[model samples]
Target chain A: MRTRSTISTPNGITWYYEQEGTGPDVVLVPDGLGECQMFDSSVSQIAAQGFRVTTFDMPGMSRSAKAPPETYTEVTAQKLASYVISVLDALDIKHATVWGCSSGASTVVALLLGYPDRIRNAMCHELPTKLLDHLSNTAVLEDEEISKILANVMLNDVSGGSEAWQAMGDEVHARLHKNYPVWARGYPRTIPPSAPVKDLEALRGKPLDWTVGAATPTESFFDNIVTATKAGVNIGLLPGMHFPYVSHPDVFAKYVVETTQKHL
Target chain B: MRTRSTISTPNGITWYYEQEGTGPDVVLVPDGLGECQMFDSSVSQIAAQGFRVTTFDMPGMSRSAKAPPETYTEVTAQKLASYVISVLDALDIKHATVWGCSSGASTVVALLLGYPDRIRNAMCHELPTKLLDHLSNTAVLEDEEISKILANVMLNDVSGGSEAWQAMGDEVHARLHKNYPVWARGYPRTIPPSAPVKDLEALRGKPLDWTVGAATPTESFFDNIVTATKAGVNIGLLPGMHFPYVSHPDVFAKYVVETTQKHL
Candidate 1:
């Protein structure tokens, strides 16, 4: 059975969390869009394996509260890290494995580097460094193009209204679905016509400098994924666009569980 | 840079290990008389900045065709637990923390129960329990005279040759330094001679009960040490004992780094 709870972070942000099972622990973190609820399907399966699964909604996303005024960029990744630590501390757990997807992958990397002593292992899937770096080079993308993309993608809410934004989300999903077959198997063919677009748009064409500060390219980070694997760190790439597990939950979950077991 | 090396076990045994830095690793082990080298002290200080420590040397004790067919009871005090696990697996360590004092301090109580994960923390000081327990069991030595005590001590060594037996070896030391204080500071002057005598006698009397098994307590069995410190698993009596650290200088050198670090 899974139980839901609220954890108050050191900075007083209340994060939503879910937990289940009774053995070793695992934590799943979502990408920058902060859609933790999207992971519910696979997390429960992991819980069934006698592990206590804990998943939490990041602040400023989903049902969680808004980010502080200054928290405009992915710097909120650090906040997620701190919040995760606080949650573990509140439960008196000393260690846990963490999984992050897409922007969530960047968050996971940041968390791992920031708190190596605390986290036991981490898995980052399809984190888009190229996308982030592209945004970071504003001289190439130009402010006008960035602004236009942002206006189209970042101005709509997924919860209600905004048919145009939902159409854009569906179009992006369709484009990815057509271009990447394996990724399409896991990703949605179409986003709801009324789905939120503002958050996705906000992430589009936005300044890349913030991501440069927040994210680390594995090739340049700690030891690179390959080197880490040789050092007994379990890592793998999922075949997909930005999110694999989300579109094809089973395949994503299979790899997640397999990789986790291999490392654990 | 990282370096790798393997050490041969006492007899025909071989085990894998790694080393860094320039000096040797001081491996504190129990079960020393049999499996002579373990990772007791290697994990303690190897990861510290300066030391190049190595861990290995158990297979020789476990699988050595040349070793005599002896059970756990026949092992030495200092060689029982800490020396084996802490020393053998680690290579290139320069110093170590001794663990098995008081007939090996119930090896269980030291590794499995006491400070199960923090074996490296054993370097700070020797536990005071054996003497404390001995003091509590005062009836054993109430009427014994000094002459009989000395004679009994001498017999412990004669039963086994100088290099062949641990008790006999300890007896030789006790006889040579009749007034020598117990290594642990604050050892009650009245307790030394009687405590070890009681400890050894108790082991001799108990023949392989389920709890103790066929393994005889060598005055420094790791099990007993683990049992003694059941209050918590992280804190351990430090500074360890004599003999092994001195006799196997290369072995114990691995654990002498300046701080405590963890390696899984």
Candidate 2:
């Protein structure tokens, strides 16, 4: 069974969230531009694996109400950290294994860094560590050049792939245009190096699983996983790029269940 | 009289722009949340001061077409620089004095840095260098603290001010909400320390006027202007807080006319 509701932030912004299944708690944070609907199939598959899956739209994305622009920032990571806690509190779930992809992965890192007590474990898939490095280096380009680079990098040909993947891509792209600003703003482009590094020590004792797509061209994912591994965090590999959950929900769900069980 | 049109970027995003008056070319770059309409009054006043005034919505802002989120980066400074040039090319103007406020000031800085030959003179009013530093520091806070800080800083009582100022603030705030994602995303949070520094040398030969409000709480503006002064750039002081142009357009127009005349 699945249920949906809205929760209000301290500043009056309302977040749309959904919950499913009836087992161990697992909260899925959507990638930037993704809404709760993007994870519909994956949530059901994960539910079948005996895990209660929770999902939500971050503030200013999709169903969530808009707040002041300044409310969306690296500093606002504190707000997001609080938001996760609020959600868990509302659901009466004491702790949850948090899973995220891309920008959502960064949000998971923020939650772990700011409020690890609320997280049972963390699974960050295809984390875009290199995108951060790229943001740091690309400040000098002209706007046209920057726009060109973004178009090339962000607008990929998911249409040429399998039917499931293409449909997912089309859905995500449409959502991206519908809520372009949130996706543009909520990206973790400005996270300080110390913010995530400071939390690494706290995360060491927790069940952490970092994964990347075997086919992704992002080299920084490997470097990030290596660093996490050096810090004693567990690592895994998935079959596709960024959103393996969209194209291979059953396989991804199996991996999630197995990992959560091992960690628990 | 004022006229409006749209120009396409090399990457195919359409930018809505406006032109008015008829004298030496003057391009007005709006602050992050500002649309072309935000500068409607100032554009007319400056045009009445015997100069052509050009204004536009930056990519992914206001009425301008949205592009991929990755395009809203420091590298995208190149795209903004090129867009300004394209505007000039379309208008058949060889060069123009560029004026900007707040985030718009950063765009002026970018234009001067990346394409100095295109700018005859540049005026940056109430620039917020410290806000960037503040954003860097605040990322480590929890959500409640960040929300409180933003409430105090971001949501000013424009309602208590003069009628015109109040109306302007209300309009801008409404626009901000309408395009909250763009303002949130397009903000220059990841600007490298070296990006602005490298161009400081190139800017010394250009006619640059960096100004700030005497009563404004943002001290970083003075520090920025001082740095520019030491490097032989011009400086001035306005009568109000951040939006001196909105509150005192006559005085601002007088200054712009005088400065542009001196440079010409």
Candidate 3:
């Protein structure tokens, strides 16, 4: 039913990932600030629905090896989207449907826009803020304030039916904070996240879909929804909030089935 | 420091909105999904810097009357920007800065493009989904799922520091959902959100600024940032995510002060 493995890049940064069920391969990407754990509750459901599902820590979270400082700055490593590709490569998955949320959604955009051959489709969920207006204020907040905000956001809904999972505001905050040091190392200040997006022309004709929690503020995602829709991405509302797949795996899985089946 | 009131149109729909501080009056229009609660924490500081900031729920949200079904469907109704212009007229305030987020940004675009004289300056915080691929899936999920999604995304980051503010995620949702039937009655099906954004002409000289969360994804708004900057809006990042003022009032206030003080 499930299998776990580690794929190390030539440079030695190892990624820890898990797969469940069997059929077409799919990868759930964790965006900035965290990793694939948000998809923890949906893997089984998606797998059982006749598609193999993969969730992995992006280089430095959980079981993955610590990403070197250069990871965020180096020309080669600047392509954050490629990290996911490396995982697919290690797993020998020639192609997949990449479903990403938050910054993960941008990564999905980067993928279909760049590696169209390897990606059959993409589902960009709850895109990050649209305005380039970014200057991390993490320095201004007291450590505890960040934790509370994190807890409130991450635990606002039922993440999983498991009692321990339901009670993880502190846990979510801890894990997110744990990786912040490495994740922030060479960010925009020191390096760049991904290469400058050359063009969005590749978005046309791509089997792409986008969902935002009906509850989520359009501020976080409205523009991309507009942009993607302009490029022909089917935009819609989904259940739960940013991490919709967690609290309502049945609905999330159904969406996966519906989206993937249409393309297949 | 603050004045609360309602503006009723001839059509009989009374809109609720509030204004705080005093210098140059600036109207902060709520976008597709939220009212002005997102602007709470920044009021006092922004006021001290000479901005009378106003925030309001659109016709269908809490404190406002249910929007007519035609609000989303009719050709004239499709010009959602006119609603904000109506607010400015009812207040008898002319030539003020208009700051709108999400679809609200597009509305500001409509205003500057159509009635350049009514606005001395404008701030389009986060533009809406640019893809015209059309809206989808809000109708597929169960009612309960939709509500939770609203709470999670809509209320995800409770930026307001006041007590009444902290407790209203559901209240906001209830108020917003209270009029959904009317809001969705015609929507994109009957009409469109705003008109096909005719063009980005300023018509004449005008000052524009855009603020997005430091934590937002570049893909979400970066393209528009380039386009807006090229078209002449001074677009930049602010502290906090979507609603920066809730956490870093000093900085958000400073940005507002710097932006508005310059043109006028």
Candidate 4:
């Protein structure tokens, strides 16, 4: 059975969350444009494999409380890391595995950096480090030009059967549209400098997996991951594009379960 | 002849600005959706009246620097107030009259509060205190819904013959579309408490005029102005909607000239 709830932050922001199953806890964080609903099926599948799953909409997106513009910057990472821990505390989970996709994955890195003790393991997928860097360094554009570019990229029909991923369908597209404004508002003007590397040695031997899709651009993240692996971090490659969970949830869930079990 | 230039903040953000005519310096701050272009004709008209008119694109909007999301809060008011001083200093003017409309007017109030010595006179128009209060109180919605609502309000045809203001035309709508992402990102979740009131007694005899459009909603600001007037502030009424200067530049310029003369 799936249970839905809300948690209040110290700053008075309300976060909408959902929980499923009854075993070891695992928290899932979505990408920049993703709401909790994006992982409904995947969360259920993972829960069926004998694990409790938790997911939430970040503040100012979907059902969560609206936040001040200041609440959406790279500087917010520390606060969000604390928020994740607070949610776990509210749910009575002493330790849990954490998973994140895209920008959500970036948050996972931040959480690991800030509160490694709370997380049993971590899985970060499809984090476009170079893309983020380029966007941050880009010169400011005319408002009209920027709007057009964003609209085309966000609203385009990515539902067609591509070799990389299956059709995203109407529901996902609708959700994307619904969440576009919040995403646009919160889109980073600059990626955090500390985001590209982490102290793998400080992980205390916890299992951490950095996974990327084969079809997605990985050149930018390759060097960073290689550097991280040299410091003893684990890396995995999946056979899909940016959103493997959307196209192949069963496989995705299987990997999550297996990887998390090793650490738990 | 009009001259264009750029100024750099200590934080490394670059501001694009324009200046015209010569005499007592006057700096114009655009409304929420405004860039320097919004007041092109108005600036020219005001400059023709023997005042050097200066205007700029605030950081993260139009041609100015694309600041991080953290730069869009009430805290930014102090930075903007400093920016006004920097602009005056860059132009080699010891003091300048400051004018702002809508959200820009809020920045003007911030300037008067933070750096009173830098301003000779101040004019703020169409500040929506109640609307800001309501927005601050409203719950956050799905991003798509917010985007649609914002698009309709901002991009709708205001060109029809309306008693409040003339048609905004296609150029204005285009600019609004272009700048929508920046505005949507920086849109305040709550109006800061410091926004609604100004200590009129602290001015030490600087002339400050609070002007509002006859056609716009004025109830919330009405009481605030009443309280400020009791504390000794000058109030003026204009015969247009939100942007009186856009509709009647000549009349607007005449009022600004007369008001600054009183303080001069």
The numbered model that scores best in TM-score is: 3
Q: Least accurate stretch of 10 residues (summed lDDT) in model 2 chain A?
A: A152-161
iRMSD of all candidate structures: 23.4, 21.3, 7.7, 27.3
- What tens digits encode model 1's per-residue C-alpha lDDT throughout B1-264? 444445554433344444445433323333222222333234433535454444332322332323232312233323334434443443423333333433343342233232344343343223233334532333234233432443344234221222322433444333323221111111232323322222433333221111111111123223222332222223222222223333333333443343223321
Docking class of 3: incorrect
A1-264 in candidate 3: lDDT tens per residue? 688877777655688788998899888887655466667667887787789998888765656746664544432223667777876887888889888776677678778777889989988876554323232444245655654554444555323234444644556556766655444442324222342223456667777887776555434555554555445556677755666665666788789878988877
In candidate 3, residue B103 scores what lDDT?
61
Please, what are the lDDT tens digits per residue for candidate 2 over residues A1-264?
788888776665677889889888989887655476767887888888788989987766667746556545442334555666776786677878888876677667777766667777888775554446564444355544544554344446221125555565555555545554444444545433323534457667666677766444323343454446546666666766666776667777888888888767
How well does each candidate superpose onto the true structure, as a TM-score?
0.34, 0.44, 0.52, 0.45
Instruction: Give the winner by lDDT: 2 or 4.
Output: 2
Candidate 4 deviant stretches above 4 angstroms = A1-264, B73-76, B128-148, B154-171, B190-192, B196-200
CA displacement after TM-score superposition, residue B192 of candidate 1 (Å)? 76
On the 0 to 100 scale, the lDDT of residue A6 in model 3 is 76
- lDDT by residue for model 3 (B151-188), tens: 44434543323333345466555666653433333242
lDDT of 2 at A154: 49
Please name the candidate that would achieve the greatest lDDT relative to the true structure.
2
Off by over 4 Å in 1: A70-79, A128-235, B1-264
Better of 1 and 3 by TM-score: 3
By lDDT: ranked, best first: 2, 4, 3, 1
Native interface contacts retained, candidate 2: 0.00
Off by over 4 Å in 3: A66-68, A72-78, A129-177, A186-198, B1-264
The number of the candidate with the highest DockQ is: 3
